[PDB]
Structure 1
C-alpha cells in the first residue's frame, strides 16, 4: 500500500486519488491473476496502469501521464489481454526553462510566472536565453536577499554558477541581461506583489530607504554592529584560554 500511494501521489510531481488507487489496485490484480502477463519488472509496473486509470473514471489528460521502449509494448499487451546568447532564433518549451529555474530550487509560482511572461512576450524575440536568464537572476536576488545580506560571498558564487551554466567566460553581458530585464519588467502588478513579499526594494528595506532618501540624518547606516552580534561574539574569546 505504501509504494502504491508513493507512485500514485507521484503524478503531481477529490475523487481522483481514491478512484485512482482503487483502479491501480484492481488493475494490478487483474494483470497478475492469470498466467498470461509475466516477465514484467515491478520496477515500472505502476505507470501505464495509472495512465489507463486516468483514462477510465471520468476525465483524461494526455500530457504528463506517460512522463519508454517497453511503455508502448506493455500498453498494447495489456489492452489486448483485457556562447548561449550569440545563437540567433532559438526555441524553448515549458520544461526546458522550468529546469533552468529549478536548478536553483526556486518555487513553482515564480517559474510559472516566467513561463507566462515568455508565452505572452516571446513573439518579437532575438534570443530567449537573455530574457529567461535575467528573469531568474532577478528572482534569485529578490528572494535570497537575507542570506546574501548575512553572507556577501553568495554574490560571486551565484554569478559564477549562472556564468558556467550558459558556457561563457565574459560576464558584462550577464550584467546587461539583468539590468535590461529589470528595465522591461519594472511595472507589472505581479512583480509588485513579489517585491512587497520578499522585501528587496533594491536590496534595502522600505522603512529604512524612505528616511535614507527623504533627507534625514537619523537614517540607520549600519557601520556599527547590532548588540546581539557582540553578545554572541563574546563567547568566542570567553574560551580563549585554550
Structure 2
C-alpha cells in the first residue's frame, strides 16, 4: 500500500522525485522482507519503518550526505529496534534483487 510506505518514509525522515526513489526502495525491501525475514506479531508492526530507515542510510551514503534521519520513529524499543534493523541490514541489503535499484 502506498499510504503506509509514504507515511513511514515521512516520519522516518522528518512527490515523484528523490522521495519517490526512497518510497520505491522501502517497497521493494519490505516485499522481500516479507518472504525472507520472519518477525512475530509485535515486531511486524515496524516492518515498513525499519525498511524505510535502511533506505535512508543508503541515501546518506550514496548521493546526498546532507540527508537527516533519526531512529526513534520505529514503534519498538530502541534496543530492540536497533537489533532488528541491524538484522535487516545485514540480511537483505546485499540481496541480489536489491542491487540494481538505481539510487540517482
**What SS class does the counterpart of residue 89 from structure 2 fall into?**
helix
- Structure having the larger proportion of residues in helix: 2
Given that 1:48 and 1:75 are in contact with CA atoms closer than 8 Å, whether structure 2 keeps it comes out as yes
Q: Could you tell me how far 1:57 is from its partner in structure 2?
A: 4.2
Unmatched segments (≥5 aa) in structure 1: 84-237
Q: Deviations over 1:49-86 (max 9, x none)?
A: 222102224647999999x1211111221123229xxx
- C-alpha distance in 2 between matches for 1:79 and 1:241: 17
Partner Cα distance (1:6, 1:52) in 2: 14
Change (3 A) 1:29 1:65: farther
Are the counterparts in 1 of residues 26 and 51 from structure 2 also a CA contact under 8 Å? yes
Which has the bigger relative contact order, CA under 8 A and spacing at least 6? 2
Q: TM-score, normalised by structure 1?
A: 0.24
What is residue 90 of structure 2 aligned with on the other side?
80
> Are the structure 2 counterparts of residues 31 and 77 from structure 1 closer, same or farther at C-alpha, using a change threshold of 3 Å?
same
Select the structure of larger CA radius of gyration.
1
8 Å contact from structure 1 (residues 7, 46) kept in 2: no
TM-score, normalised by the number of residues in structure 2:
0.48
- SS of corresponding position for 2:61: coil
Q: 1:8 to 1:58 in 2, by over 3 A?
A: closer
Shift of 1:31: 0.9
* Paired residues of 1:24 and 1:50 also in contact (CA < 8 A): yes
**Distance change in 2, residues 1:46/1:62 (3 Å):** farther
Do the aligned partners of 1:23 and 1:53 also contact (CA within 8 Å) in 2? yes
Partner of 2:24: 22
CA RMSD across the alignment: 17.5
Q: Which runs of 5+ in 2 are unaligned?
A: 1-5, 69-77, 94-99
Do the aligned partners of residues 36 and 19 (structure 1) sit closer, same or farther apart at CA in structure 2, a change above 3 Å counting?
same
What is the deviation of 1:21? 0.7
Change (3 A) 1:52 1:2: closer
Counterpart contact for 2:50–2:85, Cα < 8 Å: yes
Deviation of residue 15 (structure 1)? 2.8
Deviation at 1:241, TM superposition (A): 74
2:6 corresponds to 1:4: no
Gap change, CA 1:240 and 1:20, over 3 Å in 2 = closer
